[PDB]
Amino acid sequence: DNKTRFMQLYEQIKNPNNGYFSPEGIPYHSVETLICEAPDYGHMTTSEAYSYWLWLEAMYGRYTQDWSKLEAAWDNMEKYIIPVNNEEQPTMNYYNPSSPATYAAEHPYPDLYPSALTGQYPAGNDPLDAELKATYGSNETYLMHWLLDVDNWYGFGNLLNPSHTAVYVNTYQRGEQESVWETVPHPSQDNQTFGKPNEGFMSLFTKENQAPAPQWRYTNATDADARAVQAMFWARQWGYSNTNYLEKAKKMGDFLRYGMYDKYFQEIGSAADGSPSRGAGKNACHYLMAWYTAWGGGLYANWAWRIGASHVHQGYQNPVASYALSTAEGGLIPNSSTARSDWEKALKRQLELYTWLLSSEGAVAGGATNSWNGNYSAYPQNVSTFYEMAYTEAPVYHDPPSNNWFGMQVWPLERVAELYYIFAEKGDKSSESFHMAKHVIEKWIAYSLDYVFVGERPVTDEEGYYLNDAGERVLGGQNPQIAVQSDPGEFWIPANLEWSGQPDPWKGFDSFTGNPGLHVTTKNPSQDVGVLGSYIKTLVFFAAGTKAETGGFTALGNKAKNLAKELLDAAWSKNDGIGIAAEEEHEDYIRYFTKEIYFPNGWSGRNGQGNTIPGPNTVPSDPAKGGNGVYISHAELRPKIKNDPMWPYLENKYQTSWNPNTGKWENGLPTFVYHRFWSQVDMATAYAEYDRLIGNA
Numbered sequence: 188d189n190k191t192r193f194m195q196l197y198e199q200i201k202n203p204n205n206g207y208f209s210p211e212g213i214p215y216h217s218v219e220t221l222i223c224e225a226p227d228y229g230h231m232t233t234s235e236a237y238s239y240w241l242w243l244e245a246m247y248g249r250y251t252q253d254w255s256k257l258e259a260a261w262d263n264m265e266k267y268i269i270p271v272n273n274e275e276q277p278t279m280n281y282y283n284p285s286s287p288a289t290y291a292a293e294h295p296y297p298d299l300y301p302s303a304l305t306g307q308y309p310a311g312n313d314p315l316d317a318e319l320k321a322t323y324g325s326n327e328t329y330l331m332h333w334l335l336d337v338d339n340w341y342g343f344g345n346l347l348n349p350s351h352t353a354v355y356v357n358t359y360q361r362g363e364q365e366s367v368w369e370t371v372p373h374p375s376q377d378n379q380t381f382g383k384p385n386e387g388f389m390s391l392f393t394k395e396n397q398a399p400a401p402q403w404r405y406t407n408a409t410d411a412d413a414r415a416v417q418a419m420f421w422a423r424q425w426g427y428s429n430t431n432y433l434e435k436a437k438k439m440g441d442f443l444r445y446g447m448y449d450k451y452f453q454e455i456g457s458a459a460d461g462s463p464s465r466g467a468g469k470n471a472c473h474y475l476m477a478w479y480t481a482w483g484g485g486l487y488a489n490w491a492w493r494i495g496a497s498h499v500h501q502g503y504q505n506p507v508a509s510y511a512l513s514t515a516e517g518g519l520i521p522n523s524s525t526a527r528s529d530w531e532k533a534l535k536r537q538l539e540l541y542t543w544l545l546s547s548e549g550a551v552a553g554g555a556t557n558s559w560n561g562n563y564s565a566y567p568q569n570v571s572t573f574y575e576m577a578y579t580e581a582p583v584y585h586d587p588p589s590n591n592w593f594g595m596q597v598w599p600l601e602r603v604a605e606l607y608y609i610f611a612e613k614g615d616k617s618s619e620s621f622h623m624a625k626h627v628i629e630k631w632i633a634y635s636l637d638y639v640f641v642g643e644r645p646v647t648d649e650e651g652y653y654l655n656d657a658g659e660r661v662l663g664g665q666n667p668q669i670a671v672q673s674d675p676g677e678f679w680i681p682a683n684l685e686w687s688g689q690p691d692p693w694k695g696f697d698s699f700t701g702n703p704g705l706h707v708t709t710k711n712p713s714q715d716v717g718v719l720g721s722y723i724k725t726l727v728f729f730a731a732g733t734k735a736e737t738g739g740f741t742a743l744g745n746k747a748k749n750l751a752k753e754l755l756d757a758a759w760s761k762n763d764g765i766g767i768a769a770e771e772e773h774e775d776y777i778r779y780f781t782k783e784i785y786f787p788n789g790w791s792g793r794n795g796q797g798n799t800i801p802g803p804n805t806v807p808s809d810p811a812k813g814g815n816g817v818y819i820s821h822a823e824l825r826p827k828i829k830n831d832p833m834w835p836y837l838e839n840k841y842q843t844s845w846n847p848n849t850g851k852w853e854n855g856l857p858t859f860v861y862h863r864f865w866s867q868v869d870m871a872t873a874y875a876e877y878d879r880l881i882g883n884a
């Protein structure tokens with residue numbers, strides 16, 4: 188019974204004995220501590236985790252009409268991860284929207300940081316600051332910072348909220364090649380008690396004529412605040428009506444418009460020729476969710492700044508949130524003058540983006556940028572464009588390429604499927620937006636069905652390629668034949684994509700005739716339960732949408748709902764009492780041992796435990812990467828990780844299995860079972876939404 192399964196999994200997630208939450212009531216990234224993949228420690232947490240917590244409590248409210256849990260989750264989010272009687276953005280009022288920030292270039296290796304604050308390109312004007320002040324009386328940013336150190340494992344302490352154990356921390360600072368393995372974690376509120384004397388951590392990342400001042404700064408993740416809005420959209424659809432909290436979700440959707448702006452508010456398209464123009468009015472708005480917005484200031488401090496982001500990843504867009512923020516049906520139109528219009532344009536533009544990126548096979552390709560190379564380089568000749576933004580197959584990050592993970596298929600396509608259903612349910616079956624959502628989800632669903640297996644396991648070679656009955660690699664194509672073997676009670680879902688080509692230039696939906704030069708190979712079957720739970724919701728919302736549109740399930744809708752039912756049954760067999768549990772192998776945990784964390788020469792500082800970094804065990808940086816410094820490895824930067832209960836296993840596996848000459852694990856791979864918060868919520872909400880939308884059909 189899928190309602191009972193939802194409630195059982197809910198109970199497991201909320202059970203204090205299972206370890207998903209800290210003593211402060213904050214959800215961790217994962218129950219387990221030794222994990223490194225986006226946060227670099229399992230008891231960090233993310234705005235992502237909070238947004239999933241809201242989604243979980245909204246579904247609990249639907250069944251029980253007990254909305255006190257959703258409100259407690261919102262309160263806890265606001266207390267610990269939205270930095271709004273403690274002033275956590277203490278100089279935001281000094282922000283100058285006519286000069287929002289000082290330009291610095293991004294660089295292709297972390298080696299090349301700190302980046303000079305040259306001001307080479309004057310920032311354009313910020314058209315939101317005045318409206319937001321008019322609406323709220325303050326420009327204090329109501330968005331989640333993306334990263335907390337929940338247990339104060341890094342030891343920085345919480346500068347601006349003394350009673351909290353959880354600390355605002357950040358990591359990524361140094362461009363497209365700085366993987367999770369390559370950062371230097373640092374406090375968001377840096378008064379220079381840690382880092383380099385009289386400088387803090389700032390001088391790893393930016394250079395000025397003079398030592399940096401103490402400063403605070405935050406960065407959101409736009410997909411997380413949008414998911415929070417998506418959860419509140421659903422809560423209201425399911426009966427929630429407390430205006431005190433709905434107004435907070437509106438305010439978050441209002442400030443989330445900062446993720447619609449070019450990084451330095453340069454006019455969209457203006458640097459196609461390598462020479463940007465400072466934006467004016469709303470002409471630096473691209474009406475998409477770019478990777479972040481960030482804001483910061485001094486800690487006699489009298490200055491503050493904001494940046495949008497120029498790089499857009501399709502997997503961050505949330506059309507349900509955009510619908511929620513632009514329509515009376517959605518109920519969360521923000522109070523600022525132009526917020527409704529902005530989100531209305533954004534919803535349409537997001538659907539155009541997905542159509543533009545729809546590959547020949549059916550997966551959606553990466554995204555687009557207004558700042559080629561992160562320094563407003565001229566666009567390569569013949570690069571495909573979308574509203575004068577240049578196609579990028581790997582938005583923002585190249586290590587690993589950010590659209591190679593299949594999780595960035597199910598996460599956005601789940602929302603496109605939701606919107607398809609939402610449009611059809613109210614009787615919109617003919618708008619251009621409906622037609623784009625419908626086309627994208629139909630094609631994607633049909634794509635995905637070739638690569639997801641239940642009760643059987645696909646045949647693959649050692650590099651992860653699916654094989655056909657002749658033992659040939661399945662390299663995309665429309666009608667792949669994949670050899671299978673029996674695997675009762677198991678499921679297999681891709682983890683990886685390999686891209687080639689580009690979409691045709693976008694000239695509007697009326698001109699769209701496919702992307703026959705854009706191809707993808709799907710590979711690396713996995714048992715990722717989080718990707719699975721997102722996929723099952725995608726199947727269920729798509730199926731429900733075909734019924735709301737046509738009056739019954741289509742042939743493809745039937746396939747989708749039937750596969751969802753079987754996947755939910757197979758996954759339930761893997762519940763271990765803490766969560767849906769599957770082994771996973773980690774090739775990449777060799778990077779717990781690699782000397783690849785860059786520090787500039789001459790830079791020495793104090794970490795949060797008082798330990799000197801980088802310390803003595805350095806090697807020089809790669810000259811080919813243009814730096815002038817050194818590398819250390821993970822546990823040299825983070826010596827506490829050697830005390831983890833799983834560290835001996837991992838270290839012994841490295842010393843007995845890793846072959847440096849071949850670059851391969853030859854006596855077993857590092858193998859883990861993780862209970863990630865977001866993954867367990869994706870699963871739980873899949874049981875619930877199958878119950879709601881398919882029921883006994």
Ligand SMILES: OC[C@H]1O[C@@H](O[C@H]2[C@H](O)[C@@H](O)[C@H](O[C@H]3[C@H](O)[C@@H](O)[C@H](O[C@H]4[C@H](O)[C@@H](O)[C@H](O)O[C@@H]4CO)O[C@@H]3CO)O[C@@H]2CO)[C@H](O)[C@@H](O)[C@@H]1O
Pocket residue numbers: 225288289290291333357358359360361362392393404405406407408409478479481492494583
């Ligand atoms: O020049 C003005 C101003 O710049 C400040 O430096 C900025 C950088 O310009 C900016 O690129 C950098 O952005 C980081 C961000 O801080 C990280 O939080 C973010 O991490 C992402 C992560 O990549 C995702 O995997 C995860 O999902 O979400 C987080 C949140 O989005 O990565 C981006 C880069 O990709 O942030 C700096 C601010 O901290 C200077 O510090 C300042 O002095 C200048 O005045």
Ligand SMILES: OC[C@H]1O[C@@H](O[C@H]2[C@H](O)[C@@H](O)[C@H](O)O[C@@H]2CO)[C@H](O)[C@@H](O)[C@@H]1O
Pocket residue numbers: 224225226233235592594682715717718863
């Ligand atoms: O950065 C995207 C997303 O990654 C999640 O970790 C993924 C990882 O990127 C993928 O390589 C591995 O195979 O699967 C894990 C678990 O799904 C991470 O948990 C998210 O926080 C993060 O947003």
Ligand SMILES: [Ca+2]
Pocket residue numbers: 364365366369586
């Ligand atoms: Ca790298």
